[PDB]
Amino acid sequence: XLXRXXX
């Protein structure tokens, strides 16, 4: 949930 480079 932060940004797909990774929740």
The two tokens of residue 4 are: 């797909």
Tokens of 5: 């480079």
What is the Cα–Cα distance from 7 to 4, expressed in whole angstroms? 8
DSSP conformation letters of 1-7: -------
What determination technique applies here?
A: NMR
